[PDB]
Each structure stands twice: as C-alpha cells, then as structure tokens.
C-alpha cells in the first residue's frame, strides 16, 4: 500500500517488544542453536528469530509492512515445518502467531 514512516516504526517497535515479552515467545527470542536440533540449518533454508527482526527494525531495514510481516511469518512457518504438531515449539508457534495477528490488526488500525 504505502511505505513505512518514522511513526510506523514506533508501532513496529511496540509490536516487536510485545512479542518478546510473551510467555510463549521463549523458543523464538534468539536463533535456533545447532545443539537444539543438529539438522536444523540443513532443513530450514531461511532461519528467522525475534532478535534478528529487532536488529532489522533498529537499522530501519523494512520499507514496507509486508516485509516485516513476511519475516515474522517465517519464524512460525519454519517452526511448523521442522517440528511435528505435538512438539512444544509447534504449540508455542500457534499461540504466538495468533497473538501477532491480534497485535498486527491493532497496528494497522492505528496507521
Ligand atoms: C535459542 N533458543 C533456545 C531455546 C529454544 C530454541 N528454539 C528452537 C529449538 N529447536 N527447534 C527445533 C525449534 O524449532 C526452535 Cl523454535 C532457541
């Protein structure tokens, strides 16, 4: 639609910080450690995590909201692809994605 403004970036920071404070965000705060899953980086071609997104927000990496949403969606898509549906990581991804949608709707409403 329209490119992100400085005021949009304040809203992105608020959304990201809300995700980072969520109780079920613990699997996604930092990159997957190869010890957590030895074949992870051979299976997942574009890893993503919230610390990486935080660095990108601080550097003003994102020009459009769709790019920020795409990175967030990678976090959850990676998790559901690698893990079976009974895994605690998978369950966390389901909870946090629905929370992100709720926060995303609020962000778009405030624009
Ligand atoms: C660093 N941090 C430590 C706790 C959990 C881990 N997150 C994982 C680990 N393994 N797998 C398979 C995953 O999908 C995720 Cl999100 C990342």
From Swiss-Prot:
Expression tissues: Ubiquitously expressed, with highest levels in testis. Present in kidney, liver and brain. In the brain, highest levels are found in motor cortex (at protein level).
Occurrences of domain Bromo (ranges): 3-107
PTM summary: Phosphorylation enhances DNA-binding. Highly susceptible to proteolysis.
Domain of life: Eukaryota
Locations listed in the record: Cytoplasm; Nucleus
Domain commentary: The second PHD-type zinc finger mediates binding to histone H3K4Me3.
Annotated disorder: Neurodevelopmental disorder with dysmorphic facies and distal limb anomalies: An autosomal dominant neurodevelopmental disorder characterized by variable degrees of developmental delay, intellectual disability, speech delay, postnatal microcephaly, dysmorphic features, and mild abnormalities of the hands and feet.
Subunit structure: Interacts with MAZ. Interacts with KEAP1. Component of the NURF-1 ISWI chromatin remodeling complex (also called the nucleosome-remodeling factor (NURF) complex) at least composed of SMARCA1 (isoform 2), BPTF, RBBP4 and RBBP7. Within the complex interacts with isoform 2 of SMARCA1. Component of the BPFT-SMARCA1 complex at least composed of SMARCA1 (isoform 1), BPFT, RBBP4 and RBBP7; the complex is catalytically inactive and does not remodel chromatin. Within the complex interacts with isoform 1 of SMARCA1.
Similarity remark: Belongs to the PBTF family.
Function: Regulatory subunit of the ATP-dependent NURF-1 and NURF-5 ISWI chromatin remodeling complexes, which form ordered nucleosome arrays on chromatin and facilitate access to DNA during DNA-templated processes such as DNA replication, transcription, and repair. The NURF-1 ISWI chromatin remodeling complex has a lower ATP hydrolysis rate than the NURF-5 ISWI chromatin remodeling complex. Within the NURF-1 ISWI chromatin-remodeling complex, binds to the promoters of En1 and En2 to positively regulate their expression and promote brain development.
Protein name as it appears in the record: Nucleosome-remodeling factor subunit BPTF
Residues of the full protein shown: 2925 to 3035 of 3046
């Amino acid at each position: 639609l329209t490119p992100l403004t400085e005021k949009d970036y304040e809203g992105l920071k608020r959304v990201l910080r809300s995700l980072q404070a969520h109780k079920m965000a613990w699997p996604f705060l930092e990159p997957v450690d190869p010890n957590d899953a030895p074949d992870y980086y051979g299976v997942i071609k574009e890893p993503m995590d919230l610390a990486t997104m935080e660095e990108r927000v601080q550097r003003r990496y994102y020009e459009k909201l769709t790019e920020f949403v795409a990175d967030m969606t990678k976090i959850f898509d990676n998790c559901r692809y690698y893990n079976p549906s009974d895994s605690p990581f998978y369950q966390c991804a389901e909870v946090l994605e629905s929370f992100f949608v709720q926060k995303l709707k609020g962000f778009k409403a405030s624009r």
